Amino acid sequence: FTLNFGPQHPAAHGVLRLVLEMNGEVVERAEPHIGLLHRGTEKLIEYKTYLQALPYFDRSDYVSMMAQEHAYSLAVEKLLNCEVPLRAQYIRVLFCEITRILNHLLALTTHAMDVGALTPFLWAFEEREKLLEFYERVSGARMHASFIRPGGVAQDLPLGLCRDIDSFTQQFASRIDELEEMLTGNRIWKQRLVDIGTVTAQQAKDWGFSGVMLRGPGVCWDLRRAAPYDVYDQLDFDVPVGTRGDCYDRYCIRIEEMRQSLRIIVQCLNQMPSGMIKADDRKLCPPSRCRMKLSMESSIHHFELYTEGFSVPASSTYTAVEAPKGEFGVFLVSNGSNRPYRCKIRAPGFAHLQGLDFMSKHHMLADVVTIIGTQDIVFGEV
Amino acid sequence: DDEEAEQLAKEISKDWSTVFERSMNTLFLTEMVRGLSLTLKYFFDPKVTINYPFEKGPLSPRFRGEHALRRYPTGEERCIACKLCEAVCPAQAITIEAEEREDGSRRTTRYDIDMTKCIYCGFCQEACPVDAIVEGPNFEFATETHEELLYDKEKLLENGDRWETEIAENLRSESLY
Amino acid sequence: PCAHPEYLEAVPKATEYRLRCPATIDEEAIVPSSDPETVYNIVYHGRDQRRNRPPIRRYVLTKDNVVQMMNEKKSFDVSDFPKVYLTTVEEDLDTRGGGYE
């Protein structure tokens, strides 16, 4: 018995087009259909410079924007050998972590709105509209902040942003507590989530989950502890790791990972060195407006970096960061030219949404939206 | 194993005046009355809402909204036709054609940003050498018809003169970065 | 009787927040571009990162080389084995800093 389970609530899971082969109410197999959001991203990037390539990444995962620009930047610094300053690293993490918070605040309470709890959605989205007052203030666009450029980061924080991020972090433990007091204790929540989509660790490894769905099963594997790719080796934070694997562990993790991300934000705030914002290598970082206008040699680079590009040397690397969805890695083959060459984007949600087939076997049809909830399936990456 | 796991996870809470605690917190729905109480606290608290048309959400001088071609204080469009923004544009929205005007100084005969084919990433504002193209904080230009949304060659992007009073302010405050 | 242990008193409504609106330049930021040692010393080939790298050494192995290597590898003593990334789980409630970071 085949059922074309589509997007239950649009605007939350946009193009979800599962084709469930059911058995009464018990689902026997879930066959997701991809491509409804397949923009030509892995082709369009081959046609544009390494700078023009960056805006696609904030548009790859639309609920955790800067994590993908941070995964791309670290793939055009893996090749460029472009050492970025300490302040660029600290800002880059303070925003990758603000993005982890922006994602878990959505991927928890959009999940909690698919399950049925209507209010956590709107509380978490007031919180997200506080964090977009930081995105929009530091770069310009509330969602797609093309801000974490290859060398360092686009431009320094405004002169009042750390004070505001602090005044937000002080009041954010309470918001997590409310999102938690409203959902963690509920017997209507546990019942809707405990023993739902349980993934034994061998399955989370096999299906390349590598995210909050690889730390549910108990595999202690965070690419901020495994492969520290910034000040992360300096910052202190504990990676919460589940013990059962059910969608109630992944929720409890995403609601603790939203507190450890608060620890990382507070650290990045309390220790942010007053250094240069971009790599001093002005052939990888366009010089400031003031310098390119006054200096002829800076003007030449501002011209050959906003038209030509880097021309990062010939290589091929797989740089993977811990994006909120999971291990978002961008395999970036680079022909010597200024344009990338098959900038393949390993995006979790392409490996997670595979897991829907075995996660939601023998679960009731109303659980198939809870699974899609805890996978944090955002179809931009799929 | 799940059978033994159940037996043990239920033999953990197996001492009187603990079975009673759990029974009175699953019968007098007590986890749920802490949900209702929080929900009430938020029912009575002030509302984080904004009656939009009259007051609008906070922005920043770096905010990227409607593209505006700036002008030099003494008229003279700031847009010398280098085509750097036409080059840097990721979506290739800007189409620039250049002609030595009769005065002799280069200028763009055609400077058409296609707003629909535009990602509002501010690359044009960065790439332009003289700050000729900047994004005005407008962001309120929803058009009834698509053809209007294609911003014509240097005529509608020349409406930035109205927004110059705010664009000059944002630039005077952002240029420090 | 709820999640208010004199700590939710950090409430969401701020009412004094972004007190200095962004485009108001009370303090003019500076945002250093280059380190002071690299302002009047613009020698680049030392600082270069794009092109200052050893060239790719792609040398071929023929059967002789690999049979030589297999015969040279007499035994796989310990420390010729990849180390395990040891990670165990350990329950902790709020002990890191006392809940205050």
Partner: peptide
């Protein structure tokens, strides 16, 4: 249907961090 029902019993909540709390 003999499909495995979602048993809503489990072990009690105990926040499980990683071993790198104090000294890696």
């Amino acid at each position: 249907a003999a499909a495995a029902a979602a048993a809503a019993a489990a072990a009690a909540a105990a926040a499980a961090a990683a071993a790198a709390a104090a000294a890696a």
